[PDB]
Amino acid sequence: DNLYEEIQKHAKQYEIAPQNAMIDKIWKATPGYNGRQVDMEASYNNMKKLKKFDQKHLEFKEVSPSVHLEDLSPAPIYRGHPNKKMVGLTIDDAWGNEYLPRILEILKKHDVKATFFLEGRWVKENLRFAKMIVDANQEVGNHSYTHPNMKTLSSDEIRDQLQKTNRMIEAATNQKVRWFRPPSGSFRDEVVKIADDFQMGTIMWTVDTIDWKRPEPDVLLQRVMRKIHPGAIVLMHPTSSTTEALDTMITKLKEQGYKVGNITELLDEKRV
């Protein structure tokens, strides 16, 4: 059997079916994830010179799922797909400007993006720091205007909180707001549905650093590595604990085999 036949014989072993988006009973709205099939031409070209089959040199064509995140009814997203070897980094930003430049340097050093959920009043009062985030090519989301408990707010107040914040973000950053996150994780269905009326998904998380309690950096780091999993969304703030731990955290996440990125990248159906 020549090399081409050897690659053919291994094709089904490396095939993966696409996985559909769905609303999990516990984790709620979950994106789909592409499958893959062996690309015969690219794989052969990768193994031609050494004349031997090596699964590390396989290349693939991707296969899209049939049900997508945007097909689902309005529902919060806690996680990326549980088979996608990627973690999403998120930072809720309404204070702590003194750590923002260093956090952006750490992200640049690792060539990773994070989603910064911005409070509307913070943006209004700190336009130059909001621009600093987007000039670093980071993406921004909506974290309400004044950080209320949105579960107990009237429908009117929810709508006003979301709309005021989008108007403020879009003027400071010139980017479209795709993602909203409720302050303190407090919400009800009406919050998710109103956010959907503004073309925003609602983004919760699966791993909370609890960095606002000022944990020792190695305690924060060990908490994250213990709880992390494929598709995890990590919640941080601009704090000394996060700033002192973030560099090693990203290194250790990559050493574990995880891609690291922002929410848009995490929820993408493309394979890692």
Collect all residues with Cβ–Cβ distance below 8 Å to 162 and sequence separation of at least 6.
142, 144, 145, 180, 194, 195, 198, 200
Give yes or no for a contact between 128 and 148, defined as CB atoms under 8 angstroms apart.
no
Q: What angle do CA 191, 196, 92 make, to 5 degrees?
A: 65
Q: What angle do CA 157, 160, 166 make, to 5 degrees?
A: 145
Question: Structure solved using which method?
Answer: X-ray
Catalytic positions:
92, 237
**What fold is seen in the domain 86-267?**
TIM Barrel (3.20.20)
Resolution at which this structure was determined, Å:
1.7
With residue 267 as reference, give the H or E element that holds it. Answer: helix 263-267
Query: Cα separation of 29 and 20, whole Å?
Result: 11
In 3D space, the residue among 179, 104, 110 whose CA is nearest the CA of residue 137 turns out to be 104
Buried b (16+ CB within 10 A) or exposed e, 68-90: ebeebebbbbbbbbeebebbbbb
Torsion 230-250-252-89 (CA) sign: negative
Exposed / middle / buried, residue 111 (Cβ in 10 Å: 0-12, 13-18, 19+): exposed
Question: What are the residue boundaries of the structural domains of the chain, listed by start?
Answer: 3-70, 86-267
How close are the terminal C-alpha atoms of the chain, in Å?
A: 31
